[PDB]
């Protein structure tokens, strides 16, 4: 019985944390980043990188559970607005429905780029009464997402409490959705109507929001800057709160207690050879903020010991590894407990989305505001602007802008649905599963890949010294979308049957 706007807001707050917990607690890493080849470990979920995932994989069931937790929580909030409010304003009621529908849209948009067809649900009771329900078609899922985002665009405000969604966030996601739909199973061209809509929504955010990119890329990934102006939407973790409200990734991302102030950790992930090669030589700011590499210095990690220099010869994760409790983290670093929010949408994504929507079906983009906003991302990274861009420039730029943010894989699926032959060739040329013992730098700061001789000091350079994977799979169309989780298929055999049309309620 919610009797004030603030009481209702307390009920919608878990849409930003608890709802996402089953996904964030584990599977976000191998699905969003691993599968894109952002990083690799031979012991932690390598199958996601090498395309050898089985239906029994715990990450599939966890992700499925997490995304459906968002959907069903959203549905519960919408129901509560309509049945449990008694002095509550229409502004607050519509804001709550809008936040619920925004999150539901985000969950379905992730699922669409993991499994493809999924079950669309607006009535939780229908699911309870009969859980054996059919999949709906990819086109239905797109329309459902669009409808939810339309409501959020119309019913969120331009400004919000810090950490809460605005209409700019909804418009930014909607731009991404239209861009993703434009080429999806569309014979190698992008629908001009969807391109136009993507441009309209993205340009509105870029030109009119009054928001800007943070001056320093590294600042985006520090806890003191949670909910900075570039953060359009993020999971809002509560490190001093309940277990289901915490960001539990700290120990799985951090490679050594030397970068956690002594807090227990166990990561064996390293940035992939392919991913590391995406950073242009001049792009050291984004590279350093994403992965540690030999000799890189961090003034803001191990602050009490004058900063931190990585002295290993691998490429462990930096993004998501905020240092120890006293590294401007207000004591909020503990085992499996990170103070960082998890980004869902940054303004730089909208900039790059606008650029890609301006490129459209042309082979190059050499003028216009889309190119300007692409070049703002370059400028913020302190590297050269480009006088013209192609889709290949956009692919590279997105990988380096969003490395270790658990987003690159979803973008790669979108591209595969547009240009499947190009992207299968791309995936097969990423050297997935290859890793190497030693990555070092020369005088000019360029990375070199190889291993040490028996003496552990004499560097041997080149691919002949890489560690090859046990198996290199030829990646094909059938490999891209993941299988439905086996336990869920047992409970609902229609997950093995064709999708059917959704009956829309609007
Ligand atoms: Cl796979
Ligand atoms: Cl510390
Ligand atoms: Mg279509
Ligand atoms: Mg095969």
Coordinates of C-alpha atoms and ligand atoms in Angstrom, one line a residue:
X1 CA 0.0 0.0 0.0
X2 CA 2.1 2.9 -1.3
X3 CA 0.7 6.2 0.0
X4 CA 3.4 8.6 -1.3
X5 CA 5.5 9.1 -4.4
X6 CA 8.7 8.4 -2.3
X7 CA 7.2 5.1 -1.1
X8 CA 6.5 4.0 -4.6
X9 CA 10.1 5.0 -5.6
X10 CA 11.4 2.7 -2.9
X11 CA 9.6 -0.1 -4.6
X12 CA 11.0 0.7 -8.1
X13 CA 14.6 1.1 -6.8
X14 CA 15.3 -2.7 -7.0
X15 CA 14.7 -2.5 -10.8
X16 CA 18.2 -1.1 -10.9
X17 CA 20.0 -3.8 -8.8
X18 CA 18.2 -6.8 -7.4
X19 CA 16.4 -7.4 -10.7
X20 CA 19.7 -7.7 -12.6
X21 CA 21.6 -9.6 -9.9
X22 CA 21.4 -13.1 -11.3
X23 CA 22.9 -11.8 -14.6
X24 CA 25.5 -9.5 -13.1
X25 CA 26.8 -12.1 -10.6
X26 CA 28.4 -14.3 -13.2
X27 CA 27.2 -14.6 -16.7
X28 CA 27.5 -11.0 -17.8
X29 CA 31.3 -11.5 -18.1
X30 CA 31.5 -14.5 -20.5
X31 CA 28.4 -13.6 -22.5
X32 CA 28.9 -9.8 -22.9
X33 CA 32.7 -9.6 -23.0
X34 CA 34.2 -13.1 -23.3
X35 CA 32.1 -14.1 -26.3
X36 CA 33.3 -10.9 -28.1
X37 CA 36.9 -12.0 -27.4
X38 CA 37.5 -8.9 -25.2
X39 CA 39.4 -11.3 -22.9
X40 CA 40.2 -15.0 -22.4
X41 CA 41.0 -17.5 -19.7
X42 CA 41.8 -21.2 -20.5
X43 CA 40.1 -22.1 -17.2
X44 CA 37.2 -19.7 -16.9
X45 CA 34.5 -20.2 -19.5
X46 CA 36.8 -20.4 -22.5
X47 CA 33.9 -22.2 -24.4
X48 CA 32.2 -18.8 -24.8
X49 CA 35.2 -17.4 -26.6
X50 CA 35.8 -20.5 -28.8
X51 CA 32.1 -21.3 -29.6
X52 CA 31.9 -24.6 -27.8
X53 CA 29.1 -23.8 -25.2
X54 CA 26.8 -26.6 -24.2
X55 CA 23.1 -26.3 -23.2
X56 CA 24.1 -27.3 -19.6
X57 CA 26.3 -24.3 -19.1
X58 CA 25.5 -22.5 -15.8
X59 CA 25.9 -19.1 -17.5
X60 CA 23.0 -19.8 -19.8
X61 CA 20.6 -20.7 -17.0
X62 CA 21.9 -17.8 -14.8
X63 CA 21.5 -15.2 -17.6
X64 CA 18.1 -16.5 -18.6
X65 CA 17.0 -16.3 -14.9
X66 CA 18.4 -12.8 -14.6
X67 CA 16.8 -11.3 -17.6
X68 CA 13.5 -13.0 -16.8
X69 CA 13.9 -11.6 -13.2
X70 CA 14.0 -8.1 -14.7
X71 CA 11.0 -8.8 -16.9
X72 CA 8.9 -10.3 -14.0
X73 CA 9.9 -7.5 -11.6
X74 CA 9.0 -4.9 -14.2
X75 CA 5.6 -6.7 -14.6
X76 CA 5.1 -6.7 -10.8
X77 CA 5.9 -3.0 -10.6
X78 CA 3.4 -2.2 -13.3
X79 CA 0.8 -4.2 -11.5
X80 CA 1.6 -2.6 -8.1
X81 CA 1.1 0.9 -9.7
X82 CA -2.4 -0.2 -10.7
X83 CA -3.3 -2.1 -7.5
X84 CA -1.2 -0.9 -4.6
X85 CA -1.3 2.9 -4.8
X86 CA -3.6 4.9 -2.6
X87 CA -2.0 10.6 -2.5
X88 CA 0.4 9.1 -5.2
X89 CA 0.7 11.5 -8.1
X90 CA 0.2 10.6 -11.8
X91 CA 3.7 11.8 -12.5
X92 CA 5.1 9.2 -10.1
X93 CA 2.8 6.4 -11.4
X94 CA 3.8 7.0 -15.0
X95 CA 7.5 7.4 -14.1
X96 CA 7.4 4.0 -12.3
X97 CA 5.7 2.3 -15.2
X98 CA 8.2 4.0 -17.5
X99 CA 11.2 2.7 -15.5
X100 CA 9.7 -0.8 -15.4
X101 CA 9.1 -0.8 -19.2
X102 CA 12.6 0.6 -19.8
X103 CA 14.2 -2.2 -17.9
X104 CA 11.9 -4.8 -19.5
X105 CA 13.0 -3.4 -22.9
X106 CA 16.7 -3.6 -22.0
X107 CA 16.3 -7.2 -20.8
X108 CA 14.5 -8.3 -23.9
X109 CA 17.1 -6.5 -26.1
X110 CA 19.9 -8.4 -24.5
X111 CA 18.0 -11.7 -24.8
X112 CA 17.3 -11.0 -28.5
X113 CA 21.0 -10.8 -29.2
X114 CA 21.8 -14.1 -27.2
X115 CA 19.0 -16.5 -28.0
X116 CA 16.9 -14.6 -30.6
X117 CA 13.3 -15.8 -30.1
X118 CA 12.3 -15.6 -26.5
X119 CA 8.9 -15.7 -24.6
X120 CA 7.3 -12.3 -24.4
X121 CA 5.5 -11.8 -21.0
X122 CA 3.3 -8.9 -19.8
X123 CA 1.2 -10.9 -17.3
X124 CA 3.2 -12.8 -14.6
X125 CA 0.1 -14.8 -13.7
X126 CA -0.2 -16.3 -17.1
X127 CA 3.3 -17.7 -16.5
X128 CA 2.4 -19.1 -13.2
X129 CA -0.8 -20.8 -14.4
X130 CA 1.0 -22.4 -17.4
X131 CA 4.7 -22.2 -17.7
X132 CA 4.6 -24.2 -21.0
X133 CA 4.4 -21.3 -23.4
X134 CA 5.8 -20.8 -26.9
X135 CA 8.6 -18.6 -28.0
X136 CA 7.8 -15.5 -30.0
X137 CA 9.5 -14.4 -33.2
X138 CA 12.5 -12.1 -33.4
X139 CA 10.3 -9.5 -35.1
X140 CA 7.8 -9.7 -32.3
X141 CA 10.5 -9.2 -29.7
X142 CA 11.7 -6.1 -31.6
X143 CA 8.2 -4.6 -31.6
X144 CA 7.7 -5.4 -27.9
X145 CA 11.0 -3.6 -27.1
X146 CA 10.1 -0.6 -29.2
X147 CA 6.6 -0.3 -27.6
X148 CA 8.2 -0.3 -24.1
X149 CA 10.8 2.2 -25.1
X150 CA 8.1 4.5 -26.7
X151 CA 6.3 4.6 -23.3
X152 CA 9.5 5.4 -21.5
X153 CA 10.5 8.2 -23.9
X154 CA 7.0 9.7 -23.4
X155 CA 6.8 9.3 -19.6
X156 CA 10.3 9.8 -18.2
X157 CA 11.6 13.3 -17.5
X158 CA 14.6 15.0 -19.1
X159 CA 16.1 15.2 -15.6
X160 CA 16.0 12.7 -12.7
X161 CA 17.5 11.8 -9.4
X162 CA 21.1 10.7 -9.7
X163 CA 21.1 7.1 -10.7
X164 CA 17.6 7.1 -12.2
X165 CA 16.7 6.9 -15.8
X166 CA 15.8 9.9 -17.9
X167 CA 14.0 10.2 -21.3
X168 CA 17.5 10.7 -22.8
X169 CA 18.4 7.1 -21.8
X170 CA 15.2 5.8 -23.3
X171 CA 15.9 7.7 -26.6
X172 CA 19.5 6.4 -26.7
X173 CA 18.4 2.8 -26.3
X174 CA 15.7 3.2 -28.8
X175 CA 18.2 4.6 -31.3
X176 CA 20.3 1.5 -30.8
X177 CA 17.3 -0.8 -31.3
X178 CA 16.2 0.9 -34.5
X179 CA 19.8 0.6 -35.8
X180 CA 20.0 -3.0 -34.8
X181 CA 16.6 -3.8 -36.5
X182 CA 17.5 -1.9 -39.7
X183 CA 19.7 -4.6 -41.2
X184 CA 18.4 -7.6 -39.2
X185 CA 17.8 -10.6 -41.5
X186 CA 17.4 -7.9 -44.3
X187 CA 19.5 -9.3 -47.1
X188 CA 22.6 -7.2 -46.6
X189 CA 21.0 -3.7 -46.6
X190 CA 19.7 -1.5 -43.8
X191 CA 16.1 -0.3 -43.9
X192 CA 16.1 3.4 -44.6
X193 CA 13.1 4.0 -42.3
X194 CA 14.8 2.4 -39.3
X195 CA 18.0 4.3 -40.2
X196 CA 16.1 7.6 -40.2
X197 CA 14.5 6.8 -36.8
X198 CA 17.8 5.8 -35.3
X199 CA 19.3 9.1 -36.5
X200 CA 16.3 11.1 -35.1
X201 CA 16.5 9.6 -31.7
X202 CA 20.3 9.6 -31.5
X203 CA 20.7 13.1 -32.8
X204 CA 18.2 14.4 -30.3
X205 CA 20.3 13.0 -27.4
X206 CA 23.6 14.1 -28.9
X207 CA 22.5 17.6 -29.8
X208 CA 19.9 18.5 -27.2
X209 CA 20.5 16.6 -24.0
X210 CA 23.0 19.1 -22.6
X211 CA 25.2 16.1 -21.6
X212 CA 28.8 15.7 -22.5
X213 CA 31.4 13.0 -22.4
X214 CA 33.6 12.9 -19.3
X215 CA 36.9 14.7 -20.1
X216 CA 39.0 11.7 -19.0
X217 CA 38.0 8.2 -20.1
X218 CA 39.6 6.7 -16.9
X219 CA 37.3 8.7 -14.7
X220 CA 34.2 6.8 -16.0
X221 CA 35.5 3.7 -14.2
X222 CA 36.0 5.1 -10.7
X223 CA 33.4 4.7 -8.0
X224 CA 33.5 8.4 -7.1
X225 CA 32.1 9.1 -10.6
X226 CA 29.2 6.6 -10.5
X227 CA 26.3 8.4 -12.2
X228 CA 28.4 10.9 -13.9
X229 CA 26.8 12.9 -16.7
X230 CA 27.9 10.4 -19.4
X231 CA 26.1 7.6 -17.5
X232 CA 22.7 7.4 -19.1
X233 CA 21.7 4.1 -17.5
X234 CA 23.5 1.8 -15.1
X235 CA 22.9 -0.9 -12.5
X236 CA 23.0 0.8 -9.2
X237 CA 24.9 -1.4 -6.7
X238 CA 24.7 -1.0 -3.0
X239 CA 28.0 -2.3 -1.5
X240 CA 26.9 -1.7 2.1
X241 CA 23.5 -3.2 1.4
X242 CA 22.0 -6.7 1.0
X243 CA 23.7 -9.6 -0.8
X244 CA 21.3 -9.3 -3.8
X245 CA 22.2 -5.6 -4.0
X246 CA 25.9 -5.9 -4.5
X247 CA 28.2 -6.1 -7.5
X248 CA 29.8 -9.5 -6.9
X249 CA 32.3 -9.4 -9.8
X250 CA 35.3 -7.9 -7.9
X251 CA 37.1 -11.2 -7.2
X252 CA 36.5 -12.7 -10.6
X253 CA 37.9 -9.7 -12.4
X254 CA 40.9 -8.8 -10.2
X255 CA 44.1 -10.8 -10.9
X256 CA 46.0 -10.1 -7.7
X257 CA 45.7 -8.8 -4.2
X258 CA 48.3 -6.2 -5.2
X259 CA 45.4 -4.2 -7.0
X260 CA 42.7 -4.9 -4.4
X261 CA 44.4 -3.7 -1.2
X262 CA 44.7 -7.3 0.0
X263 CA 41.1 -8.3 -0.7
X264 CA 40.8 -11.9 -2.0
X265 CA 40.6 -12.4 -5.7
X266 CA 41.3 -15.1 -8.3
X267 CA 41.0 -13.8 -11.9
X268 CA 42.9 -15.6 -14.7
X269 CA 41.3 -13.5 -17.5
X270 CA 43.7 -11.6 -19.8
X271 CA 42.8 -9.2 -22.6
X272 CA 43.0 -11.2 -25.8
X273 CA 45.8 -10.8 -28.4
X274 CA 43.1 -9.7 -30.9
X275 CA 41.5 -7.2 -28.5
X276 CA 44.9 -5.7 -27.5
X277 CA 45.7 -5.2 -31.2
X278 CA 42.5 -3.1 -31.6
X279 CA 44.1 -0.2 -29.6
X280 CA 45.9 2.1 -31.9
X281 CA 49.4 2.9 -30.7
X282 CA 48.3 6.4 -29.6
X283 CA 45.3 5.0 -27.7
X284 CA 47.0 4.4 -24.4
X285 CA 44.4 6.0 -22.2
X286 CA 41.6 3.6 -23.2
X287 CA 44.0 0.7 -23.3
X288 CA 45.4 1.4 -19.8
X289 CA 41.9 1.9 -18.3
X290 CA 40.8 -1.4 -19.7
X291 CA 43.8 -3.8 -19.3
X292 CA 47.1 -3.7 -17.3
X293 CA 50.1 -4.2 -19.6
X294 CA 53.8 -4.2 -18.6
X295 CA 55.1 -0.9 -17.2
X296 CA 51.7 0.8 -17.2
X297 CA 51.4 3.2 -14.3
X298 CA 48.2 4.1 -12.3
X299 CA 48.3 7.1 -10.0
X300 CA 44.9 6.2 -8.6
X301 CA 45.5 2.6 -7.7
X302 CA 47.6 1.8 -4.6
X303 CA 47.5 5.5 -3.8
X304 CA 49.1 5.0 -0.3
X305 CA 52.1 3.5 -2.0
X306 CA 52.5 6.2 -4.6
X307 CA 50.5 4.6 -7.3
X308 CA 50.8 1.2 -9.0
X309 CA 52.9 -0.1 -11.8
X310 CA 52.0 -3.4 -13.4
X311 CA 55.2 -5.5 -13.6
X312 CA 53.9 -8.7 -15.0
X313 CA 53.9 -9.8 -18.7
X314 CA 50.3 -10.6 -19.2
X315 CA 47.2 -8.5 -19.7
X316 CA 44.9 -8.7 -16.7
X317 CA 41.7 -6.7 -16.4
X318 CA 41.8 -3.1 -15.2
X319 CA 38.2 -2.0 -16.0
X320 CA 36.1 -3.2 -13.1
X321 CA 39.1 -3.4 -10.8
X322 CA 38.9 -0.1 -8.8
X323 CA 41.8 -0.7 -6.4
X324 CA 41.7 -1.3 -2.7
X325 CA 39.3 0.0 -0.1
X326 CA 41.4 3.2 0.4
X327 CA 41.9 4.0 -3.3
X328 CA 39.2 6.7 -3.1
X329 CA 36.7 3.9 -2.6
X330 CA 35.5 4.9 0.9
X331 CA 36.3 1.5 2.2
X332 CA 33.8 -0.1 -0.1
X333 CA 35.9 -2.9 -1.6
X334 CA 35.5 -6.4 -0.1
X335 CA 35.6 -10.0 -1.4
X336 CA 33.1 -10.3 -4.2
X337 CA 32.0 -6.7 -3.6
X338 CA 32.8 -3.9 -6.0
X339 CA 31.6 -0.3 -5.5
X340 CA 31.3 0.3 -9.3
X341 CA 28.1 0.6 -11.1
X342 CA 27.6 -1.6 -14.1
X343 CA 27.0 0.5 -17.2
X344 CA 24.0 -0.3 -19.5
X345 CA 24.3 2.9 -21.6
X346 CA 26.9 5.6 -21.9
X347 CA 26.6 8.8 -24.0
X348 CA 29.6 7.7 -26.1
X349 CA 27.5 4.7 -27.3
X350 CA 24.9 7.1 -28.5
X351 CA 27.6 9.1 -30.3
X352 CA 28.9 6.0 -32.1
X353 CA 25.3 4.8 -32.8
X354 CA 24.5 8.1 -34.4
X355 CA 27.6 7.9 -36.6
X356 CA 26.7 4.3 -37.7
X357 CA 23.2 5.4 -38.5
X358 CA 24.5 8.3 -40.6
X359 CA 26.8 5.9 -42.5
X360 CA 23.7 3.9 -43.3
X361 CA 24.1 2.0 -46.6
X362 CA 26.9 4.1 -47.9
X363 CA 30.4 2.7 -47.9
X364 CA 31.9 5.8 -46.3
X365 CA 30.8 8.7 -44.2
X366 CA 32.8 11.9 -44.8
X367 CA 30.7 14.7 -43.5
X368 CA 27.8 15.6 -41.2
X369 CA 27.1 15.6 -37.5
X370 CA 27.3 11.8 -37.2
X371 CA 30.9 12.0 -38.1
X372 CA 31.4 14.9 -35.6
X373 CA 30.1 12.8 -32.8
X374 CA 32.3 9.8 -33.8
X375 CA 35.2 12.2 -33.7
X376 CA 34.2 13.4 -30.2
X377 CA 34.8 9.9 -29.0
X378 CA 38.3 9.9 -30.7
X379 CA 39.0 13.4 -29.3
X380 CA 38.1 12.3 -25.8
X381 CA 40.6 9.4 -26.1
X382 CA 43.2 12.0 -27.2
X383 CA 43.8 10.4 -30.6
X384 CA 43.4 11.7 -34.1
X385 CA 40.1 12.5 -35.7
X386 CA 39.1 10.7 -38.9
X387 CA 38.1 12.6 -42.1
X388 CA 36.0 9.7 -43.2
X389 CA 34.8 6.4 -41.6
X390 CA 33.6 3.0 -42.8
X391 CA 31.8 0.3 -40.9
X392 CA 35.2 -1.2 -40.2
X393 CA 36.2 2.0 -38.4
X394 CA 33.0 1.8 -36.3
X395 CA 33.6 -1.8 -35.4
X396 CA 37.1 -1.1 -34.1
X397 CA 36.1 2.1 -32.4
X398 CA 33.3 0.4 -30.5
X399 CA 35.5 -2.5 -29.4
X400 CA 38.1 -0.1 -27.9
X401 CA 35.5 2.3 -26.4
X402 CA 33.5 -0.5 -24.7
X403 CA 36.1 -3.2 -23.9
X404 CA 35.3 -5.1 -20.6
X405 CA 31.9 -3.4 -20.4
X406 CA 30.1 -6.6 -21.3
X407 CA 28.6 -5.0 -24.4
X408 CA 30.7 -5.9 -27.4
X409 CA 29.2 -9.3 -28.0
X410 CA 25.7 -8.0 -28.4
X411 CA 26.9 -5.5 -31.0
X412 CA 28.7 -8.3 -32.8
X413 CA 25.4 -10.3 -33.0
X414 CA 23.6 -7.3 -34.4
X415 CA 26.3 -7.0 -37.1
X416 CA 26.1 -10.8 -37.8
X417 CA 22.4 -10.5 -38.4
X418 CA 23.1 -7.7 -40.9
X419 CA 26.3 -9.0 -42.7
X420 CA 26.6 -12.6 -41.7
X421 CA 29.4 -13.6 -44.1
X422 CA 31.5 -10.6 -43.2
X423 CA 31.1 -11.3 -39.5
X424 CA 31.7 -15.0 -39.7
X425 CA 35.0 -14.2 -41.5
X426 CA 35.7 -11.6 -38.8
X427 CA 35.1 -14.1 -35.9
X428 CA 37.3 -16.7 -37.5
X429 CA 40.1 -14.2 -37.9
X430 CA 40.1 -13.2 -34.2
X431 CA 42.5 -16.0 -33.2
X432 CA 40.1 -17.0 -30.5
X433 CA 41.7 -19.2 -27.8
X434 CA 45.2 -18.2 -28.8
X435 CA 47.1 -16.6 -25.9
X436 CA 50.7 -16.0 -25.2
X437 CA 53.1 -16.0 -22.2
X438 CA 54.7 -12.6 -22.6
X439 CA 53.4 -9.3 -23.8
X440 CA 56.0 -6.5 -23.5
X441 CA 56.7 -3.0 -24.8
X442 CA 59.4 -1.4 -26.9
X443 CA 60.8 2.1 -26.5
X444 CA 58.0 3.6 -28.6
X445 CA 55.5 1.8 -26.3
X446 CA 54.3 -0.6 -28.9
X447 CA 53.1 -4.1 -27.7
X448 CA 55.1 -7.2 -28.7
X449 CA 53.6 -10.7 -28.3
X450 CA 55.5 -13.9 -27.6
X451 CA 57.2 -15.8 -24.8
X452 CA 60.4 -16.0 -22.8
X453 CA 63.0 -18.7 -23.4
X454 CA 63.9 -21.2 -20.6
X455 CA 65.8 -18.4 -18.8
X456 CA 62.6 -16.4 -18.4
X457 CA 64.3 -13.2 -19.6
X458 CA 65.1 -13.7 -23.3
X459 CA 62.0 -12.6 -25.3
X460 CA 61.0 -14.7 -28.3
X461 CA 58.6 -12.9 -30.6
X462 CA 55.7 -13.9 -32.8
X463 CA 52.8 -16.2 -33.5
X464 CA 55.0 -19.3 -33.5
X465 CA 55.4 -18.8 -29.8
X466 CA 51.7 -18.3 -28.9
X467 CA 49.9 -21.0 -27.0
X468 CA 47.3 -22.5 -29.5
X469 CA 43.9 -23.6 -28.2
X470 CA 43.2 -27.3 -27.8
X471 CA 40.7 -26.9 -30.6
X472 CA 40.0 -24.3 -33.2
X473 CA 36.4 -24.5 -34.3
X474 CA 35.3 -23.1 -37.7
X475 CA 32.7 -20.6 -36.6
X476 CA 29.5 -20.9 -38.6
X477 CA 26.0 -19.3 -38.5
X478 CA 24.6 -22.0 -36.3
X479 CA 27.2 -21.2 -33.6
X480 CA 26.3 -17.6 -33.1
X481 CA 23.1 -17.7 -31.1
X482 CA 23.3 -19.7 -27.8
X483 CA 21.2 -22.7 -27.0
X484 CA 18.2 -22.5 -24.6
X485 CA 19.3 -23.6 -21.1
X486 CA 18.7 -27.4 -20.7
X487 CA 16.9 -27.2 -17.4
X488 CA 14.5 -24.6 -18.9
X489 CA 13.9 -26.8 -22.0
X490 CA 13.0 -29.7 -19.7
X491 CA 10.4 -27.6 -17.9
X492 CA 9.1 -26.0 -21.1
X493 CA 9.5 -28.2 -24.2
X494 CA 8.1 -25.5 -26.4
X495 CA 11.6 -23.9 -26.2
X496 CA 12.5 -26.6 -28.8
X497 CA 9.5 -25.7 -31.1
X498 CA 9.1 -22.9 -33.6
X499 CA 8.3 -19.4 -32.4
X500 CA 4.8 -18.0 -32.9
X501 CA 3.3 -14.6 -33.3
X502 CA 2.7 -12.5 -30.2
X503 CA -0.7 -11.1 -29.5
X504 CA 0.0 -7.4 -28.8
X505 CA -2.1 -5.4 -26.4
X506 CA -1.3 -2.1 -28.1
Ligands
LIG1 CL1 28.9 -21.6 -28.7
LIG2 CL1 43.7 0.1 -0.1
LIG3 MG1 13.1 -6.3 -40.8
LIG4 MG1 30.8 -26.7 -35.7

